[PDB]
Amino acid sequence: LTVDQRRWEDLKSRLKIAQPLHLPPRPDNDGFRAKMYDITQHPFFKRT
């Protein structure tokens, strides 16, 4: 086989294993939960 078909087989074997994310959505029980879940998805504090 050529290199593009080898790359396609690599794409097949990569999507063979991988699974989607299971991250929970935004909880609206109080303002503290929302304002902590808003701030922790910031690329500055993650860099800190």
Curated annotation (Swiss-Prot):
Family (UniProt): Belongs to the NALCN family.
Role according to the record: Voltage-gated ion channel responsible for the resting Na(+) permeability that controls neuronal excitability. NALCN channel functions as a multi-protein complex, which consists at least of NALCN, NALF1, UNC79 and UNC80. NALCN is the voltage-sensing, pore-forming subunit of the NALCN channel complex. NALCN channel complex is constitutively active and conducts monovalent cations but is blocked by physiological concentrations of extracellular divalent cations.
UniProt subunit comment: Found in a complex with NALCN, UNC79, UNC80 and NACL1; these auxiliary subunits are indispensable for the function of NALCN channel. Interacts with UNC80; required for the NALCN activation/inhibition by GPCRs in neurons. Found in a complex with NALCN, UNC79 and UNC80; UNC80 bridges NALCN to UNC79. Interacts with CHRM3.
Portion of the full sequence shown: 1168 to 1215 of 1738
Subcellular localization, as worded in the UniProt entry: Cell membrane
PTM notes: Phosphorylated on tyrosine residues.
Positions on the Cytoplasmic side per record topology: 1-43
Lineage, broadest ranks: Eukaryota, Metazoa, Chordata, Craniata, Vertebrata
Pathology noted in the entry: Hypotonia, infantile, with psychomotor retardation and characteristic facies 1: A neurodegenerative disease characterized by variable degrees of hypotonia, speech impairment, intellectual disability, pyramidal signs, subtle facial dysmorphism, and chronic constipation. Some patients manifest neuroaxonal dystrophy, optic atrophy, unmyelinated axons and spheroid bodies in tissue biopsies. Congenital contractures of the limbs and face, hypotonia, and developmental delay: A disease characterized by congenital contractures of the limbs and face, resulting in characteristic facial features, abnormal tone, most commonly manifested as hypotonia, and variable degrees of developmental delay.
Domain remark from Swiss-Prot or TrEMBL: Contains 24 transmembrane helices (TM) that form four homologous functional repeats connected by intracellular linkers. Each of the four internal repeats contains five hydrophobic transmembrane segments (S1, S2, S3, S5, S6) and one positively charged transmembrane segment (S4). S4 segments represent the voltage-sensor. S4 transmembrane segments lack some of the charged residues (K and R) found at every third position in the S4s of the NaV, CaV, and KV channels.
Organism this protein belongs to: Homo sapiens (Human)
This protein's name: Sodium leak channel NALCN
Superkingdom, natural source: Eukaryota
